Structures are given as structure tokens and as C-alpha cells.
Amino acid sequence: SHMCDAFVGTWKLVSSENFDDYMKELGVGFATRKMGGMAKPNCIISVNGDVITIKTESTLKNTEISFILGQEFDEVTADDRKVKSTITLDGGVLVQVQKWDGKSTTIKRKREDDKLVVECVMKGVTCTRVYERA
Ligand SMILES: O=C(O)C1=C(C(=O)Nc2sc3c(c2-c2nc(C4CC4)no2)CCCC3)COCC1
């Protein structure tokens, strides 16, 4: 268990593996995959009381979520899915599930040495994205 404070910061994407495959497995099209593949977002994580905010800022598109751990929320994803999301803290890992149309995907954010490591799973595809502090 890392606590929410190990996460707070401004993080820049430095590596990504299998992200096009992850988007493809979700059904995303060529145009959105084209914007996402070489994007290098900044992820800005902040807290105030029970509310955590995660901003994902990129040249071609910005998105943001705010949530309370364990409380489901509606989310419009970068690829325009309308999902129901729940985020919890398990062993220091922020575990997000998105549910829509009988499907689910998991985004797990963990602190590992100097890295914010983001594991994105859809079916048999596993993508790993690594951020470092700006
Ligand atoms: O924060 C992260 O690293 C994570 C994601 C992310 O950064 N996605 C980003 S940045 C960005 C785009 C997309 C994008 N994602 C998706 C679907 C895969 C969901 N389609 O487009 C498109 C517009 C340009 C900027 C995705 O989910 C998990 C973890």
C-alpha cells in the first residue's frame, strides 16, 4: 500500500507497449487510434478530501475524471465510449474498471521506483504505459 499522496503529481508518458492493440481490442477506429498511438500525455493527479482528479492532457485531446474511491461514476472515454467506472485502492494500486455493453476493461495505476506504471487490459491484450515525473 502506497496511499493516494504517492500518486499526486504531474507525470509525462515516456514509454508505451501494445497501446494500438489495446485500442483495437476495444473497437476504437483508425482516426482515434491515429491520435492516440504517438500521443505523449501528461497525467495530472490531485486530491482534495475524498475527491481524486486525474487529468490526461495531450496536444490533440484533453480528458478528465473526478471520483471518490468505491463510488461508481459515469465516464465518457477518449474514444467516446459511455461507460460506468469504479476505482478502488488495493495494495497501493489504483484499480479502475470500466463497464459498458456487457464488456469490461481494467486500468491499474501503480507507483514502482520512479515510475507511474499503467497496465491496461482488454480480453487477451495487455498494454503497459510508463510515466515519469515532469
Ligand atoms: O492514461 C493513460 O495512459 C491511459 C489512456 C490514455 O492516455 N489514452 C489516450 S491519450 C490520448 C488518446 C487516448 C485514447 N485512449 C483510447 C482508448 C484506449 C482507451 N483512445 O484514445 C486519444 C486522443 C489523444 C490523446 C487510455 O486508457 C487507459 C490508460
Short mmCIF file of C-alpha atoms and ligand atoms in Angstrom, two decimals:
data_model
loop_
_atom_site.label_atom_id
_atom_site.label_comp_id
_atom_site.label_asym_id
_atom_site.label_seq_id
_atom_site.Cartn_x
_atom_site.Cartn_y
_atom_site.Cartn_z
CA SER A 1 0.00 0.00 0.00
CA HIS A 2 1.17 3.25 -1.37
CA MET A 3 -1.53 5.89 -0.30
CA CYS A 4 -3.16 8.45 -2.59
CA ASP A 5 -0.30 11.01 -1.90
CA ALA A 6 2.42 8.74 -3.77
CA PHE A 7 0.34 9.36 -6.87
CA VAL A 8 -0.13 13.15 -6.62
CA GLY A 9 1.90 14.96 -9.25
CA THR A 10 2.36 15.84 -12.88
CA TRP A 11 3.54 12.82 -14.90
CA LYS A 12 4.71 12.62 -18.53
CA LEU A 13 4.40 9.49 -20.70
CA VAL A 14 7.84 8.05 -21.50
CA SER A 15 7.06 4.55 -22.87
CA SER A 16 4.11 2.54 -24.15
CA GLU A 17 3.76 -1.10 -25.21
CA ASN A 18 0.78 -2.62 -27.06
CA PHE A 19 -1.40 0.53 -26.91
CA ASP A 20 -2.58 0.24 -30.54
CA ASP A 21 -3.56 -3.39 -29.86
CA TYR A 22 -5.43 -2.30 -26.70
CA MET A 23 -7.37 0.37 -28.60
CA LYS A 24 -8.10 -2.07 -31.43
CA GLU A 25 -9.41 -4.67 -28.94
CA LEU A 26 -11.80 -2.02 -27.59
CA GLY A 27 -13.11 -1.34 -31.13
CA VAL A 28 -11.60 2.13 -31.49
CA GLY A 29 -11.25 3.37 -35.27
CA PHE A 30 -8.33 4.37 -37.36
CA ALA A 31 -8.85 8.09 -36.70
CA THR A 32 -8.83 7.88 -32.90
CA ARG A 33 -6.08 5.24 -32.92
CA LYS A 34 -4.05 7.62 -35.08
CA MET A 35 -4.41 10.39 -32.49
CA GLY A 36 -3.66 8.03 -29.58
CA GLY A 37 -0.74 5.95 -30.79
CA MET A 38 2.08 8.52 -30.68
CA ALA A 39 0.41 10.75 -28.07
CA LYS A 40 2.57 11.51 -25.12
CA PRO A 41 0.07 12.77 -22.47
CA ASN A 42 0.69 14.44 -19.20
CA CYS A 43 -1.27 12.79 -16.39
CA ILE A 44 -2.03 15.23 -13.53
CA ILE A 45 -3.25 13.55 -10.34
CA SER A 46 -4.56 15.61 -7.41
CA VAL A 47 -6.69 15.08 -4.30
CA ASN A 48 -8.88 17.17 -2.22
CA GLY A 49 -10.67 15.42 0.66
CA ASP A 50 -12.44 12.30 -0.67
CA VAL A 51 -12.25 13.51 -4.38
CA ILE A 52 -9.40 12.37 -6.63
CA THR A 53 -8.95 14.09 -10.01
CA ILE A 54 -6.98 12.61 -12.90
CA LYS A 55 -6.39 14.88 -15.93
CA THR A 56 -4.99 13.35 -19.13
CA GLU A 57 -3.71 16.27 -21.23
CA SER A 58 -2.45 15.87 -24.80
CA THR A 59 -1.97 18.10 -27.84
CA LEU A 60 -4.92 16.68 -29.75
CA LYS A 61 -7.35 15.99 -26.88
CA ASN A 62 -7.74 16.50 -23.11
CA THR A 63 -9.90 14.44 -20.76
CA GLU A 64 -10.52 14.49 -17.02
CA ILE A 65 -12.22 12.35 -14.37
CA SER A 66 -13.02 13.09 -10.73
CA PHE A 67 -14.19 10.36 -8.39
CA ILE A 68 -14.50 9.04 -4.88
CA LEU A 69 -12.90 5.63 -4.26
CA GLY A 70 -15.54 2.89 -4.33
CA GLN A 71 -18.33 5.11 -5.78
CA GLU A 72 -19.37 4.29 -9.39
CA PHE A 73 -19.38 7.20 -11.84
CA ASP A 74 -20.34 7.78 -15.46
CA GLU A 75 -17.42 8.49 -17.80
CA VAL A 76 -17.01 9.41 -21.49
CA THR A 77 -13.71 7.89 -22.55
CA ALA A 78 -11.20 9.37 -25.02
CA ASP A 79 -12.64 7.02 -27.68
CA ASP A 80 -16.23 8.14 -26.91
CA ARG A 81 -17.45 5.08 -25.05
CA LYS A 82 -20.11 5.81 -22.42
CA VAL A 83 -19.01 3.64 -19.51
CA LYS A 84 -19.67 3.05 -15.81
CA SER A 85 -16.39 3.29 -13.90
CA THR A 86 -15.35 2.26 -10.39
CA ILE A 87 -11.91 2.94 -8.90
CA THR A 88 -10.56 1.44 -5.68
CA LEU A 89 -7.16 1.41 -3.92
CA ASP A 90 -5.99 -2.39 -3.49
CA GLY A 91 -2.49 -2.81 -2.03
CA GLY A 92 -1.44 0.63 -3.06
CA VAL A 93 -2.68 0.19 -6.65
CA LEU A 94 -5.44 2.40 -8.06
CA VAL A 95 -7.60 -0.19 -9.83
CA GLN A 96 -10.14 1.15 -12.35
CA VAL A 97 -12.78 -0.91 -14.11
CA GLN A 98 -14.92 0.45 -16.95
CA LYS A 99 -18.13 -1.46 -17.82
CA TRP A 100 -20.27 -0.97 -20.94
CA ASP A 101 -22.40 -3.27 -23.13
CA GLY A 102 -21.59 -6.31 -21.17
CA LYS A 103 -17.85 -5.73 -21.54
CA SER A 104 -15.19 -4.58 -19.09
CA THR A 105 -11.63 -3.25 -19.22
CA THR A 106 -9.19 -2.64 -16.37
CA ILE A 107 -6.71 0.22 -15.95
CA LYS A 108 -4.33 -0.32 -12.98
CA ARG A 109 -2.03 2.55 -11.87
CA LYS A 110 0.87 1.76 -9.54
CA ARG A 111 3.86 3.57 -8.23
CA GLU A 112 7.18 1.48 -9.00
CA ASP A 113 10.51 3.18 -8.20
CA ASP A 114 10.41 6.49 -10.13
CA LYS A 115 7.68 5.20 -12.50
CA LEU A 116 3.83 5.60 -12.57
CA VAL A 117 3.05 2.30 -14.31
CA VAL A 118 -0.32 1.93 -16.03
CA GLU A 119 -1.48 -1.58 -17.02
CA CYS A 120 -4.44 -1.61 -19.46
CA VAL A 121 -6.19 -4.95 -20.12
CA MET A 122 -8.93 -5.81 -22.61
CA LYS A 123 -9.55 -9.53 -23.11
CA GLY A 124 -6.20 -11.11 -24.02
CA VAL A 125 -4.43 -7.81 -24.71
CA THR A 126 -2.21 -6.22 -22.05
CA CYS A 127 -0.76 -2.73 -22.59
CA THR A 128 1.82 -1.16 -20.30
CA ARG A 129 2.35 2.64 -20.20
CA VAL A 130 5.05 4.25 -18.08
CA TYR A 131 5.06 7.84 -16.88
CA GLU A 132 7.79 9.76 -15.02
CA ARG A 133 7.52 13.00 -13.12
CA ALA A 134 7.58 16.09 -15.22
O1 LIG B 1 -3.86 7.47 -19.19
C1 LIG B 1 -3.42 6.52 -19.90
O2 LIG B 1 -2.24 6.33 -20.19
C2 LIG B 1 -4.47 5.67 -20.46
C3 LIG B 1 -5.13 6.02 -21.68
C4 LIG B 1 -4.76 7.19 -22.47
O3 LIG B 1 -3.90 8.01 -22.18
N1 LIG B 1 -5.47 7.31 -23.66
C5 LIG B 1 -5.32 8.31 -24.61
S1 LIG B 1 -4.42 9.70 -24.51
C6 LIG B 1 -4.93 10.30 -25.87
C7 LIG B 1 -5.92 9.48 -26.59
C8 LIG B 1 -6.12 8.33 -25.77
C9 LIG B 1 -7.06 7.22 -26.14
N2 LIG B 1 -7.35 6.18 -25.39
C10 LIG B 1 -8.21 5.48 -26.15
C11 LIG B 1 -8.80 4.18 -25.77
C12 LIG B 1 -7.85 3.20 -25.11
C13 LIG B 1 -8.93 3.83 -24.32
N3 LIG B 1 -8.47 6.03 -27.30
O4 LIG B 1 -7.72 7.20 -27.30
C14 LIG B 1 -6.63 9.84 -27.88
C15 LIG B 1 -6.51 11.28 -28.15
C16 LIG B 1 -5.11 11.77 -27.95
C17 LIG B 1 -4.66 11.62 -26.55
C18 LIG B 1 -6.23 5.06 -22.15
O5 LIG B 1 -6.84 4.26 -21.15
C19 LIG B 1 -6.07 3.86 -20.35
C20 LIG B 1 -4.82 4.50 -19.78
#
